[PDB]
Structure 1
Amino acid sequence: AGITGTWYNQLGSTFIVTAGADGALTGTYACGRGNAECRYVLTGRYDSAPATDGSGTALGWTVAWKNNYRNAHSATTWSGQYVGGAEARINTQWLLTSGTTEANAWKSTLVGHDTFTKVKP
């Protein structure tokens, strides 16, 4: 599907993903340094039979920010689409939610965007 492989955002974070025949996404999200301490599990889904009209391929994934080294009590979803071609990209918007008390719910969820490319920034 052209999705499988290593992707880099413009801050130089990386994730590696396997797109399954079935529509499964599985892999790992890491800081650009790539040490164990900054790797986290990533699971999601994608449209495994996209349009052939030049549309992108819709996907999303989640990372819970807990590994064997660290727990940020939070989780980020990226929602977006894969766009193929000589300059493939994955264009995304994300929601980072932290666990809060009900008082602090107002500040629970950050929003932002990421463009992933096959080559580093």
Structure 2
Amino acid sequence: GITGTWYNQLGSTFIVTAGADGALTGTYESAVGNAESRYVLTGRYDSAPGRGDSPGSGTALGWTVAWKNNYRNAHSATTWSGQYVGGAEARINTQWLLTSGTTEANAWKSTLVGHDTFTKVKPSAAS
């Protein structure tokens, strides 16, 4: 379900393997098709999401990307927290926090918040 490639609605993609131990491992590409925009991803997911009181519930998950690779260091990291929903219309609905390293005086403004909806498909076109 979760293993594979995901697209947000803004130009980014990631590939992830969801392992039997609850691990998420992959790569996040902040600009689709840009091979220099790839960063390590790591996280965790609920590997036994079934519940009797709440049937049909999504699968909780989270991951982190530190925005450092051989081409960029934004001295920050994003974490996404969300849930996977399967079915015809599979998606991962998330909220994210991006924290940048700051001086003490600037710590109050170190963290941005946002949201991303990831889908298995996006509109696409031949070149």
Structure 2-normalised TM-score? Answer: 0.90
Deviations 1:90-111 (A, max 9, x none): 0000000000000011110000
2:88 and 2:32 mapped to 1: Cα distance? 27
Cα deviation, residue 36, structure 1: 2.8
Structure 2 counterpart of 1:57: 59
Structure 1 counterpart of 2:9: 10
% identical aligned pairs: 94
Secondary structure of the corresponding residue to residue 106 of structure 1 = helix
Give 4+ residue runs of structure 1 displaced > 2 Å after superposition.
Answer: 31-36
Return the index of the structure with the highest Cα Rg. 2
Cα deviation, residue 120, structure 1: 1.4
Which consecutive unaligned segments of at least 5 residues does structure 2 have? none
Which consecutive unaligned segments of at least 5 residues does structure 1 have? none
Deviations 1:61-108 (A, max 9, x none): 000000011100000000000000100000000000000000011110
Higher relative contact order, structure no. (Cα contacts within 8 Å, ≥ 6 residues apart): 1
Cα deviation, residue 42, structure 1: 0.2
RMSD, aligned α-carbons: 1.1
1:33 and 1:53 mapped to 2: Cα distance? 35
2:32 and 2:107 mapped to 1: Cα distance? 32
Deviations 1:2-59 (A, max 9, x none): 0000000000200000000110000000033333320000000000000x71000000
Contact 2:100 2:110 in 1 (8 A): yes
Contact 1:12 1:120 in 2 (8 A): no
2:33 and 2:43 mapped to 1: Cα distance? 21
Deviation larger for 28-37 or 88-97: 28-37
Contact 1:98 1:109 in 2 (8 A): yes
Contact 2:13 2:32 in 1 (8 A): no
Deviation larger for 34-43 or 100-109: 34-43
Structure 1 counterpart of 2:78: 76
Structure 1 counterpart of 2:29: 30
1:95 and 1:33 mapped to 2: Cα distance? 21
* Equivalent pairs, count: 119
